[PDB]
Amino acid sequence: DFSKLSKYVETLRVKPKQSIDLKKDFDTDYMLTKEEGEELLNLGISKLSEIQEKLYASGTKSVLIVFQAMDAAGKDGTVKHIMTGLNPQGVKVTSFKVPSKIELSHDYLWRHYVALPATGEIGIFNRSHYENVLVTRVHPEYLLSEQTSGVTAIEQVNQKFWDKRFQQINNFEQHISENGTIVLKFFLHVSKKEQKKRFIERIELDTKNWKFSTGDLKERAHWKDYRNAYEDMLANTSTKQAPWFVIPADDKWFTRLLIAEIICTELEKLNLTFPTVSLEQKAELEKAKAELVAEK
Numbered sequence: 171d172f173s174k175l176s177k178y179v180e181t182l183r184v185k186p187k188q189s190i191d192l193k194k195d196f197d198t199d200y201m202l203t204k205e206e207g208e209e210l211l212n213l214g215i216s217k218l219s220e221i222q223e224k225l226y227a228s229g230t231k232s233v234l235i236v237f238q239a240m241d242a243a244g245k246d247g248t249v250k251h252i253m254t255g256l257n258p259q260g261v262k263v264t265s266f267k268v269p270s271k272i273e274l275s276h277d278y279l280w281r282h283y284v285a286l287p288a289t290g291e292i293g294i295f296n297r298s299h300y301e302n303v304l305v306t307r308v309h310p311e312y313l314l315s316e317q318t319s320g321v322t323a324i325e326q327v328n329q330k331f332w333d334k335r336f337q338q339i340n341n342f343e344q345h346i347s348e349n350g351t352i353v354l355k356f357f358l359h360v361s362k363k364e365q366k367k368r369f370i371e372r373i374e375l376d377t378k379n380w381k382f383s384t385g386d387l388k389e390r391a392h393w394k395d396y397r398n399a400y401e402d403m404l405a406n407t408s409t410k411q412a413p414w415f416v417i418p419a420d421d422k423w424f425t426r427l428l429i430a431e432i433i434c435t436e437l438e439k440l441n442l443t444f445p446t447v448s449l450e451q452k453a454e455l456e457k458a459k460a461e462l463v464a465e466k
């Protein structure tokens with residue numbers, strides 16, 4: 171069961187006042203066996219599905235879950251594994267890609283605001299608004315195609331620009347959080363060494379190499395720039411109301427376990443329950459059964 175897991179999970183939450191060194195302080199691989207994790211993961215997925223059903227039936231809340239990671243951290247597989255357990259009618263996964271021409275004619279939050287979950291729904295942001303302080307920070311020339319960014323030469327970008335953005339993001343998440351949205355953000359943290367192992371494995375297998383983009387190496391070459399961006403992001407946009415969690419990503423079964431456990435534990439704070447049947451509704455059910463029974 172969950173005895174020690176419960177305490178370890180709490181260490182993964184980024185506290186608001188905390189400073190962040192991903193190299194030193196957050197292990198990309200870490201208590202239980204893999205066999206035990208797999209069975210515990212299957213309970214977590216079943217509980218999450220019961221929570222989803224209660225949320226959908228009478229929740230006064232919506233749920234927004236964010237995933238961000240470096241390439242080959244296992245994001246896509248984690249998202250998939252979570253979905254397989256859940257009902258499609260109350261859960262929507264939006265995978266955010268390079269902005270379209272229309273999206274670039276709007277502020278960088280617009281396409282995310284558009285996709286927010288409705289009351290009783292779980293929205294999964296597979297990549298998110300945080301892209302606007304990650305890939306665009308490493309590659310500030312993308313800011314030049316953003317008609318709304320106010321950036322005409324990359325020389326203009328400095329720490330005040332990112333600070334301003336952290337303030338906008340926090341104000342956005344605070345607003346939706348004050349209007350019924352439970353927001354959970356996950357950073358899947360893969361080591362450089364494990365990323366290389368996975369890249370090479372994908373290059374060598376005909377079942378995956380048709381899918382491999384050699385562009386991923388170019389982003390790996392910016393590892394330190396990405397690390398700086400993640401650290402600054404985590405240090406400034408984790409709040410008690412909208413927390414970040416840093417999840418070790420080098421063992422995939424453990425990644426998934428941790429995320430399922432954290433989502434269940436956080437949503438259990440809502441004290442959701444299934445609707446109950448009043449005496450009046452009980453009489454109606456019984457009258458319906460009597461009618462079926464009386465049928466010619």
Ligand SMILES: Nc1ncnc2c1ncn2[C@@H]1O[C@H](COP(=O)(O)OP(=O)(O)O)[C@@H](O)[C@H]1O
Binds near residue numbers: 265268297301312
């Ligand atoms: N706001 C953004 N600005 C620029 N690029 C973005 C933005 N949001 C997402 N992207 C980029 O879109 C790409 C999506 O890559 P893709 O292979 O389709 O998906 P994934 O890697 O999530 O499975 C990533 O390179 C990501 O950095």
